[model samples]
Target: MSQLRIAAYGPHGSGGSGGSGGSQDLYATLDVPAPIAVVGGKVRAMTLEGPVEVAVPPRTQAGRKLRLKGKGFPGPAGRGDLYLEVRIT
Candidate 1:
């Protein structure tokens, strides 16, 4: 009996289960200017990030993750930062 309940309630991963609002981390992949992309660009309409703008620094390389604060679905308690995966094009 106890074992059964333990497995069922393990982690308690349900709607409105634990945590404040169940906000998840957003992982978005976008392209920026190549050859050390030093500029900003749109987030595109695919991710639905709402015209998000990402400023890529100079000498930036591919597979780099840029973090945008308070741009994701929502923080664990309030808002989460958007981690943009870079793809130099």
Candidate 2:
């Protein structure tokens, strides 16, 4: 269960499930070149991601912005290229 699934953009936006902070399920979405992040109850295992576009400073649009590049799961020097922009005013 380690092949790198790092791409992220869940900083200013992300969730799914239960327990108050639930609802963080967006499996895959980023042009759909290779999108597919389906999971089961209790969370077992699943991988398929996409996240890009890092760095957009200056208030970052002043209300929500996300970016990330994947590759992390006990691999690539502990992981791969990954970044996530944030801004909420």
Candidate 3:
């Protein structure tokens, strides 16, 4: 089975006791489907909202991280970004 590690850093101000602002840095390991080929300078991956297409430069390497803006936890100003670390199986 293939595993995908997604690390999301929430707003810096929020964290353990005595901290107030937003959520803390959260990490999650999930099972991701086979990576989609980078076609037309873009790659598609499955997200909770739906399938998301991200533009990737030519000759991208494994362990590359793709950030989805405003796809993370809610903060005082706005939502954080969801960082998807891509690992090809």
Candidate 4:
């Protein structure tokens, strides 16, 4: 069985940058709904804001890195980006 998993890491909490907390980078991961051909294309991923289209290039191998700009946790500066690590099964 093949399953796609989505993982996310946020920069900071709702406290924002008003406290002694320092700025940090955010991260996230998404899994495809089904095992599709490696032809490479855009896949729809679900996020806190909603569903967004992620670009998947052609002939991509395992451990491929994909980035979704401004899709992370809301913070002072703005919404951080969400990154996806692709793993082919």
Per-model clash counts, in order, read 3, 8, 0, 1
Residue pairs with colliding backbones in model 2 are 4-72, 7-70, 15-23, 15-24, 16-23, 16-24, 17-23, 51-68
Summarize candidate 3's per-residue lDDT along 8-78 as a digit string, tens digits.
Answer: 22334354332322232223222233444233244556667576555543333456554444455876545
What TM-scores do the predictions have? 0.51, 0.18, 0.41, 0.44
lDDT (Cα) of model 1: 0.49
* Tens-digit lDDT track of model 1 for 4-76: 0101113345675344322554667766666546554333323443553443445556776655545556644
lDDT per residue, candidate 4, 1-89, as tens digits? 42122222223447433233213434455454334426766776666658776655555555654544444456665544455766665
The Cα local distance difference test for each model comes to 0.49, 0.27, 0.43, 0.49
Pick the winner on lDDT between candidates 3 and 4: 4
Best candidate, TM-score-wise? 1
> Least lDDT summed over 10 consecutive residues: which range in candidate 2?
32-41
Compose the digit string of candidate 2's lDDT tens values, residues 16-84. 321222122222222211111111111122334434332232223322222223332234233233322
Ranking by lDDT: 4, 1, 3, 2
Residue 4 error, candidate 4, Å: 19
Candidate 1 regions exceeding 4 Å error are 1-23, 36-53
